[PDB]
Amino acid sequence: LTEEQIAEFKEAFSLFDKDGDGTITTKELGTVMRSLGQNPTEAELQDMINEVDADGNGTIDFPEFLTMMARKMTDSEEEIREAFRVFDKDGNGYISAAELRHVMTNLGEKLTDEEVDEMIREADIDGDGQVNYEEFVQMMTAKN
Length: 144
Ligand SMILES: COc1ccc(S(=O)(=O)N(CCO)c2ccccc2CN(C)C/C=C/c2ccc(Cl)cc2)cc1
Ligand SMILES: [Ca+2]
Ligand SMILES: [Ca+2]
Ligand SMILES: [Ca+2]
Ligand SMILES: [Ca+2]
What we know:
host-virus interaction; calcium; cilium; long qt syndrome; binds calcium ion; Recoverin, domain 1; mainly alpha
């Protein structure tokens, strides 16, 4: 993995690790999931951790987070369409910088307006300034 790839994998880890202690717990995962419109049970949350908890300490650290990421990037298209609907709040089929800003805000992240534009620009393929589903699939999965 390149160094750019790595510092971004470290930013994703920070969204889930709210308290910043280097571990992702079931309570931190349930907080993120609910901020994304989901509602996992206590058992579903433990299962998410158990699938990648190699050392058996009940939490997810950075190596196990990178293993979880490599798995999700399965062929469960519904998981991707569900995530798209969370960004696409007005449902018109295109994620705007404003809608994307709103999502990061509900995850409590402090971001600049340009930083949101950089995020759109990297997922944008046709150049229309927004992210449709096909571009979303390629951003979320190993497609292309
Ligand atoms: C239901 O399954 C999920 C769960 C969480 C997310 S996630 O998006 O929270 N996520 C970031 C934390 O790892 C993520 C998770 C897994 C894989 C990829 C990502 C996206 N990252 C790389 C940055 C993405 C940047 C980006 C840009 C442009 C647009 Cl329009 C939208 C997003 C997605 C689907
Ligand atoms: Ca933590
Ligand atoms: Ca662990
Ligand atoms: Ca939209
Ligand atoms: Ca686009």
